[PDB]
Amino acid sequence: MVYKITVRVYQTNPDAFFHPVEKTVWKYANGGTWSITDDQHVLTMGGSGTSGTLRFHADNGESFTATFGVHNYKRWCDIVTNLAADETGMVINQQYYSQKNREEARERQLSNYQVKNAKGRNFQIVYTEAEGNDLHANLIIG
């Protein structure tokens, strides 16, 4: 069965403005699509076992990735900050299926995750619909 993750982005801090610069879809489970409906980022996936990554950039230089997926039928998420110039969204997304620390994050099947970058800015994902096939998450930028 298809899994869908609908993402709403909340920017709370006027000291920066982030915008999406990359949207990737991993190749497992017949892939999927990132679309937009009413300013929400919708990731539609062919079944359980894949994910997609949104990369955001602020004009002040800050950036991060937010990755959303389903692993053994349960949602997961992760945020990577302090990105190198050669860590594009497609690099990060693939690492969830090759790099140990990323694979472990996926395997945790988190309904919520937060992390701060080197400047102390908080980034959080919270699934407000956290079970079943029609999943909804807030991405909250501090």
Ligand SMILES: CC(=O)N[C@@H]1[C@@H](O)[C@H](O)[C@@H](CO)O[C@@H]1O
């Ligand atoms: C500050 C930062 O980006 N830390 C992350 C963490 O958020 C993420 O869970 C991880 C595994 O993918 O790699 C990095 O340790």
